[model samples]
Target: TTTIYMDIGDKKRTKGDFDGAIRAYKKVLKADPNNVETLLKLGKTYMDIGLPNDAIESLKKFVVLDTTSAEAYYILGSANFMIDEKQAAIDALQRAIALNTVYADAYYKLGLVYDSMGEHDKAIEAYEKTISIKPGFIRAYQSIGLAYEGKGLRDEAVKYFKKALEKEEKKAKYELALVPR
Candidate 1:
């Protein structure tokens, strides 16, 4: 009888029991080694548990199976980044952006990779691209602001920080829930 290991994994994962989910997914993989859904779920679960090196193995195999999946590449990039594999992260994230031009989060993540590598200008460019793709993405502006600050461009830093704050203000107005008095 084929057990519902993948469903069990999904249920455990949804409840934030990553360890249990990982175990369930591993059992699923042992039975259905090439299952794409199991691979993706396992890889992301590893990442969520701060086991990026583990995530890499599954994500790498998934990428080989599905080169057209932008999210797979993005998750792979993040896994690399979490492991301090900066060049690998850059390569994966760039591929993700190339695969999907409108992926603003990928651009933002690329900016973070560049920033971590001390490539300030490259980080700024990536952050700018993220902002262009998603004008209300406050984190991009915040990253840009910090990047400028790192470069001693205080004026530009302040400008971007203010931009982020303004965006956050707008979001607050739209998303805020009023409390009963």
Candidate 2:
């Protein structure tokens, strides 16, 4: 029965029926309150529906149950960031990066948090790490450009922005070429 609800939750989530997915995941949790999988699913569903506070609650529980999941920490960081919990976001994202040194997304998110906190140098460092780990991460380049701009480095800002735009155009063209005629 719990497995059946899990399946239903997965199906609803994939179908973009976020509310239904939440309901199904809650059912699984009701049956097994400590179900880590269900907590993760429910937390992600809350995030999908723009409920960061709820996502934080569920994901916090998930991390307590399973401390080794880098992805869970990353999600928890993102949820905290959404709610303006800058310090909490930084803590979780840093934990994620410590667990997975090459986690580009976590670095990118950490950069954003630093940028929001007006720490342009730290943001640039984090964004640089993101690009080093995943060279094709176009957003990292753009973020670096923004950080440079924040630091009043117009020339450096323009250089990175142009790099990002070049990459963006190339990707757009490549994707367009893949379209079915």
Candidate 3:
């Protein structure tokens, strides 16, 4: 019972049924209007539906309800990032990681922003934090490799690329093998 709604929502989300996930999240929210997890799920589903504005609204609701929740910030950052709000995305993600050092996803995202901005050293730092926080993390490794290449560290870059592709193979099997915490 504790996770029934979440389990169903996750099932729908994983299947790429954003509309179904949205309905499930709405049901959960109707039953428990202030449910933080539901808010996050709804926001994420909106993003999957390609409705970045709706995602922002739902994520903002989560952020308002739980200012200290790193997930809320990360979700917000992701939504903003999808909409190409680079500065806002970076700020939200950086704060998310600062609030929860174990949020490797935020680190990975920050690396993306820095990499795009051509701040290779900062990108490398962010990417390193992502890997240090979550060894064998799929996206982290790949993004770190990119950052390393941007920094002109070709050999190290290739090493990380290999590690990244290897983990991608393993993690894809499990669907969530990459570390997020």
Candidate 4:
């Protein structure tokens, strides 16, 4: 049955058996071509195994079938970025942000694309938006520092780098306090 195959796919994916998961997911897709959830799982499994092109194909199908899923667009964007399709990545991430106004990860990925393109100011703008949406996003702070450095603004870079380090240390201390003795 398709449901059985879907369950097998999920189980194998969880067990880190990506090839088995892909086979099961393909079985499900064979029986039900428009299974959106299966497509997403398949795409994610492909990504886990470093097959970004395959992930892009699966996610493209998913987006065509379900336009309202911001997560699908975000994953699609990430897959595009992995394959160095920068413009496609930006377009997909922009669609995700449009679907969910406060999507911090999408903004962060947009910043990364801008950074890769040497557009440091645009990258900083995107990273700042990510921080505003999710204040404790440590990587955003680090990326902002990097973006400033890219722009040759050493003082601004140092300030954000220090902030990121402080945040990271605080988070580590908090997690350490939570550990069982």
Clashes of 1: 0
C-alpha TM-scores of all predictions:
0.85, 0.87, 0.66, 0.88
Lowest summed-lDDT stretch of 10 residues in model 2?
171-180
For lDDT, the strongest prediction is 4
lDDT of each: 0.89, 0.92, 0.82, 0.93
On TM-score, who's better, 1 or 4? 4
Candidate 1 vs candidate 3: the TM-score winner is: 1
Instruction: Kindly report which residue stretches of model 4 are placed more than 4 angstroms away from their true locations once superposed.
Output: 168-181
Report the Cα lDDT for residue 62, model 2.
88
lDDT of 4 at 165: 84
Rank order (by lDDT, best first): 4, 2, 1, 3
Q: Per-residue alpha-carbon lDDT of model 1 for 21-80, expressed as tens digits?
A: 999999988888878878898999998888999999999988888888889999999889
Of models 1 and 3, which has the larger lDDT? 1
Which ten-residue region of model 3 has the weakest summed lDDT?
170-179
Highest-TM-score candidate: 4
Q: Relative to the unseen true structure, what is the Cα RMSD of model 1?
A: 3.2
Which pairs clash in the backbone of model 2?
A: none
Write one digit per residue (lDDT tens) for candidate 2, span 2-33: 89999998998999998898999998988898
lDDT at residue 47 of model 2 (Cα atoms) = 85
Q: What C-alpha RMSD separates each model from the true structure?
A: 3.2, 3.0, 7.1, 2.9
lDDT for model 1: 0.89
